[PDB]
Amino acid sequence: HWGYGKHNGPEHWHKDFPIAKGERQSPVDIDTHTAKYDPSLKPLSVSYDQATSLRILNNGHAFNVEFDDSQDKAVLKGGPLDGTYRLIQFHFHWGSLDGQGSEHTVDKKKYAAELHLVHWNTKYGDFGKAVQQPDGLAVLGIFLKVGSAKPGLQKVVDVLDSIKTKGKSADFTNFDPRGLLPESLDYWTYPGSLTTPPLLECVTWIVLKEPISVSSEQVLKFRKLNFNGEGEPEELMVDNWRPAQPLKNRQIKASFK
Ligand SMILES: COc1cc(/C=C/C(=O)O)ccc1O
Ligand SMILES: [Zn+2]
C-alpha cells in the first residue's frame, strides 16, 4: 500500500496511480517572482461560523478532522472560485524536523508543516462525485512555522494521544476552524490535484501567503503519532508530505501585489 517510506513513498506512487505524472499535479513550488498578480481575483470568503466538526481520525497517513457537510455550514467562496464549496475535513502534513514538512514551497522554502482545509463544489452533490471533476474541490493551504503557539490548534494537539495509531478515531465536536487561520487572506492560486493517492486532478489550490505560527511543543505532538496500527511496531508519523511536482503548463496567480 502507498505511504511515505523508502519502498512505498512518493517516487513509487506512479505505479499504482499513473496520474502521479500528470499535467496538473500538486504540490508545486510557488516562485513568488513568477506568480502574477491578477486584479480580477476577488477576496476569499471563508464562512466558518456555523461549522460542525464531528470527529478526528488517524487514517495511517495523517489525521483528519471531519465536518458535517450535509448542508452549507462551513463554506469557501469567492477568490478564484465559482459557486460554493463545503468544508469536509482538514488535515496536516509535517516533518521530522522544523526545516521540512510542507508540501508547497515558496521560492524553494519549506515550512515545518502545512494545513489543508478540503472543500467540495456543491454543484456536484457529494465529495465522491466532485473529485471526478476538474473544478470539484477547493483546498485552502496554510503554512505552519515554529515559533509562538497557536491557541486555536491546542484542542487538536491535546486529542492526538487518543488517536495515536492507524484506524483510531475520537469525538471532536465543537471545534472552530477559524482559530487556525492567519490574519491575512492574501493567497496564490493554481489548478492542481490531491497530494495523496488517488492524486486526482480536481483541485483549485488556494495557498495563503501568511503562515501561522505553532510552538515547538505543538509540532512535537504531531510527531508522536504513528503510521502503524495498535499492536504493530512503532513507526512515527513524520514526513508525510509529497514534494514539489513539475508546474508544467500552469500559471500561479497572486491575489496581492
Ligand atoms: C480520496 O478520499 C479523500 C481524500 C481527501 C484529500 C486528499 C488530499 O488532500 O490529498 C479528503 C477526503 C477524502 O475522502
Ligand atoms: Zn493534504
Mark whether 61 is an active-site residue.
yes
Cα-to-centroid distance, 92 and ligand 2 (Å): 6
Ligand 1 proximity of 196 Cβ (cutoff 6 Å): yes
Is 193 within 8 Å of 22 (Cβ atoms)?
yes
Residues 6+ apart with CB under 8 A from 154: 218
Long-range contacts of 67-76 (CB under 8 A, 24+ apart): 69/120, 69/127, 72/122, 74/47, 74/48, 74/50, 74/177, 75/45, 75/47, 75/119, 76/44, 76/45, 76/46, 76/47, 76/117, 76/119, 76/138, 76/140, 76/206
Q: Give ∠ CA 88-71-131 in degrees, rounded to 5.
A: 40
Give the integer Cα–Cα distance in Å for 107 and 102: 13
Q: What are phi and psi of 97, to 5 degrees?
A: -140, 155
Element (H, E) at 156: helix 154-159
501585489: which residue's cell? 257
Give the integer Cα–Cα distance in Å for 82 and 254: 17
Ligand 1 proximity of 238 Cβ (cutoff 6 Å): no
Resolution in A: 1.5
| DSSP-assigned beta bridge partners for residue 105 | 29
Give the integer Cα–Cα distance in Å for 194 and 230: 28
Is 89 within 8 Å of 66 (Cβ atoms)?
yes
The count of domains in the chain is 1
Give the integer Cα–Cα distance in Å for 115 and 243: 15
Give the integer Cα–Cα distance in Å for 29 and 36: 14
Give the residue numbers spanning the domain of 234. 1-257
SS3 130: helix
- The single-letter DSSP state of residue 139 is E
- Give CA torsion, residues 164, 170, 176, 182, to 10 deg: 10
Residues 6+ apart with CB under 8 A from 7: none
Give the integer Cα–Cα distance in Å for 137 and 250: 17
Cα-to-centroid distance, 196 and ligand 2 (Å): 7
Distance between start and end Cα atoms, the chain? 43
Q: What are phi and psi of 124, to 5 degrees?
A: -100, 0
Q: What are phi and psi of 173, to 5 degrees?
A: -85, 165
Neighbour-count burial of 90, counting CB atoms closer than 10 A to its CB (0-12 exposed, 13-18 middle, 19+ buried): buried
Q: How many residues are given for the chain?
A: 257
Cell numbers at 156, concatenated:
487538536
Is 191 within 8 Å of 52 (Cβ atoms)?
no
Cα-to-centroid distance, 110 and ligand 2 (Å): 15
Candidates 44, 38, 79; CA nearest to 251 is 38
Give the integer Cα–Cα distance in Å for 85 and 78: 10
486526482: which residue's cell? 200
Binding site for substrate: which residues? 195-196
Binding site: which residues? 91, 93, 116, 195-196
Q: What is the CATH number of the domain that holds 180?
A: 3.10.200.10
